[PDB]
Design a protein around this ligand. Sequence first.
Ligand SMILES: CNc1ncc2cc(-c3ccc(-c4nc(C)ccc4OC)cc3Cl)c(=O)n(C[C@H]3OC[C@H](N)CO3)c2n1
Length: 264
Amino acid sequence: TNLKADPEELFTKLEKIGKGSFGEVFKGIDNRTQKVVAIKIIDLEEAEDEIEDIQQEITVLSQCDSPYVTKYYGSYLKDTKLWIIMEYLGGGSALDLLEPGPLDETQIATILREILKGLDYLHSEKKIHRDIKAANVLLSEHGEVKLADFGVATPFWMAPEVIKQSAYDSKADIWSLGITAIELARGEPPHSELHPMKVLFLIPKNNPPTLEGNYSKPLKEFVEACLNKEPSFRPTAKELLKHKFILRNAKKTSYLTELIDAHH
Ligand SMILES: CNc1ncc2cc(-c3ccc(-c4nc(C)ccc4OC)cc3Cl)c(=O)n(C[C@H]3OC[C@H](N)CO3)c2n1
């Protein structure tokens, strides 16, 4: 965390991307490199309770060096405002691109596959994302898919063992991915119309959700493989990259450029 170099001199904000975790995020320019950056600015006095959360997410992402995790560039503290500088991803989130209209399975598989490479890099480094969902998967202008907005230590994407506050491992991410697959194919997670507290007991109590509708069987089997109530019966991210649904449908990441151009 740099406190001597003035972030307002190092960076040129250009537009507000939107609100984010605990602060506003800007599309910006590193003035030394003139590369585009994402800049979250947090007033630490206005969010004193969540500061360990902020610290934890900075710590976990500063330890990631993978094409599939949003790159971390540093932090700056000017008076009470913390600037968190990250890679900028100009294609938006996976959830943004579900809004132009329902995704076909080629796009679902290609995004799923890229997410899985992120999960497998993380899980091999003994890390957990803890909040895998469409809104936390960001895409570049050229179709690359990267994980962002890590959780630290809404329930719709949570594994049943996570809800029941048991010690959870990488298999929680696998469950969340199975929910994300349903989201990318349907637009929203299971139980999305229900009050969160109801969903909090539905997930431990009920059978795993399955992908309903007119989809190919491998997509349904990909989902149900992820959505196993027992975490130790969920495949690794490495296993799932060989799932028949991924092998038959996933394309090159550049194929998504068309879908990204639809959103703009
Ligand atoms: C659209 N393009 C795009 N490119 C890049 C980003 C990067 C972030 C981002 C994320 C997290 C943290 C962070 N935060 C804390 C609290 C601690 C440490 C942290 O980083 C180490 C910092 C940033 Cl700079 C960002 O908010 N967004 C927008 C964001 O997308 C996901 C969506 N769910 C909400 O809106 C982005 N957008």
